[PDB]
């Protein structure tokens, strides 16, 4: 997986899947390895599935591919979430 941070919106809650529970994660990929890696990374970062705002994923029944998007903006309510996730990445890549 390749991860980038920028200011482009590619998924919307009124068009694709709003992942709220790890059981619902099964609708985002066609391979068990990819699902396992996604859950692995999200739990390594430190996301509480049933306590923090969800993230968005695309359903498998499309010939597009695999994409998943997280909101980590630095304003409004999400500001606070931006802190949490931030620290997460700060403890894995040895840099940021």
């Amino acid at each position: 997986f390749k991860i980038s941070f920028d200011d482009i919106a590619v998924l919307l809650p009124e068009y694709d899947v709003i992942i709220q529970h790890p059981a619902d994660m099964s609708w985002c990929s066609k391979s068990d390895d990819q699902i396992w890696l996604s859950q692995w990374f999200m739990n390594a970062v430190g996301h509480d599935w049933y306590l923090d705002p969800p993230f968005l994923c695309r359903n498998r029944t499309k010939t597009e591919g695999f994409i998943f998007q997280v909101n980590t903006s630095k304003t409004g309510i999400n500001e606070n979430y931006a802190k949490k996730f931030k620290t997460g990445m700060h403890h894995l890549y040895r840099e940021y």
Partner: antibody
Amino acid sequence: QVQLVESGGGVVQPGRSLRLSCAASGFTFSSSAMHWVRQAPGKGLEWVAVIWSDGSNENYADSVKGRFTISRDNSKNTLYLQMSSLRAEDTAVYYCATDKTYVSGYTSTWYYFNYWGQGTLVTVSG
Amino acid sequence: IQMTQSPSTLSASVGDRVTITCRASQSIDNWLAWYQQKPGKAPKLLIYTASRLESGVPSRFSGSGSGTEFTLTISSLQPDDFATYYCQHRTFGQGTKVEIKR
């Protein structure tokens, strides 16, 4: 230069299904979604049909749901649209346009029409 | 996702700076495009994602906004611009007519 031609239009009686052709050349036709859009004479535009590059997933507006259907021939670089159960309200100008599925490093159905044809006229009248 | 435009008809002259506002029912981030149309012609896309400018488009056009509200701005109005303009996210806008004033 990207070139696109539309044909298969004119004046037709109601109750007859019509087949319209949209030929494309100059780009990788197998890797770009296609759209059909409609404008009634004197009114604004309206998105009608969309097909992605794989040829598997389609989408249509509710006003033509169940009556219109688009397919494509990648070998012949052609797009074929069928219209059925025609009414007087479907008389309009039809365009077929190529979508831009790449924006700054991402691939999806952005619903951006980038290259257009001269536009055909369909007159459903008796 | 409904969309609405303001105003419907606009009057301007050569060299004027003109603004068009487009409001969506619910937040769509930056998923919006601005199109130009002339009488008896084919629609030509102008603005990507409310920010970027398509190659070949005059530099006097630009866009801004986000979320639910967006705006198209023309700094200097040229004779080739008296036309109809549309903003599209899901469907098209109702159309704003940039028209000469006399």
